[PDB]
Design a protein around this ligand. Structure first.
Ligand code: MG
Ligand code: ZN
Length: 225
């Protein structure tokens, strides 16, 4: 049998909204939209665009931003029960995200351990917010992703695993192409349908857990116990 291996995005997938976007709408000058549009058009890399977006913001905003995000962000229904199911079955599980640990960590506290969280780091030691990118592109990726999901997936997975990707962003199509099944919303769902990637839509993680359990290859794997 083939062991399941699950990777899951954070902003817009685990949370209802894109926390980077909401930070920018709330604190950034209008120029942030031009940077966003450059990332969308592929004029700017993710790393370059996101870096420049956070670099609009004075580090003196640390606590207001942190406070804003933790009260703004809402976790999608069923997520806790889903991680409990992962744990119950000892399924490899990783959150791989372009977000910043100053909000990803507190939002996942008591649910996901830090060795399962691959995200970027925002520093507040300079005049303007600075990003460190500890999981950047290696190997065959040279796309300046910032947090390189394909590179992390190749690093962590093993031969013959049944790779399940869960996401929402159109920029995670390369990760979805590596999956045997993609749970997709929003523009990622359109990309999976367009490129004929094996996929399923989802409203919440109750639905995700139910569907995962009844994937043939997952059932086979479980029924060795
Ligand atoms: Mg997302
Ligand atoms: Zn990359």
């Amino acid at each position: 049998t083939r062991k399941p291996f699950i990777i899951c995005d954070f902003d817009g997938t685990i949370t209802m909204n894109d926390n980077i976007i909401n930070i920018m709408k709330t604190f950034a000058p209008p120029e942030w939209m031009a940077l966003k549009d450059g990332v969308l058009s592929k004029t700017l890399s993710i790393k370059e665009g996101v870096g420049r977006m956070f670099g609009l913001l004075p580090s003196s905003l640390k606590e207001e931003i942190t406070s804003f995000v933790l009260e703004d962000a809402k976790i999608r229904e069923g997520f806790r029960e889903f991680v409990a199911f992962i744990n119950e079955h000892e399924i490899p599980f990783y959150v791989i995200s372009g977000g910043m640990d100053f909000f990803v960590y507190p939002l996942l506290e008591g649910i996901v351990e830090k060795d399962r969280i691959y995200c970027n780091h925002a520093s507040f030691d300079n005049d303007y917010i600075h990003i460190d990118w500890p999981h950047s592109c290696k190997g065959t990726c040279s796309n300046q992703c910032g947090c390189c999901k394909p590179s992390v997936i190749h690093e962590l997975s093993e031969p013959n695993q049944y790779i399940i990707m869960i996401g929402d962003s159109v920029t995670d199509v390369e990760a979805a192409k590596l999956s045997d099944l993609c749970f997709a919303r929003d523009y990622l769902l359109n990309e999976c349908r367009e490129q004929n990637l094996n996929h399923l839509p989802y409203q919440d993680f109750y639905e995700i857990r139910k569907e995962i359990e009844n994937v043939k290859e997952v059932q086979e794997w479980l029924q060795n116990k």
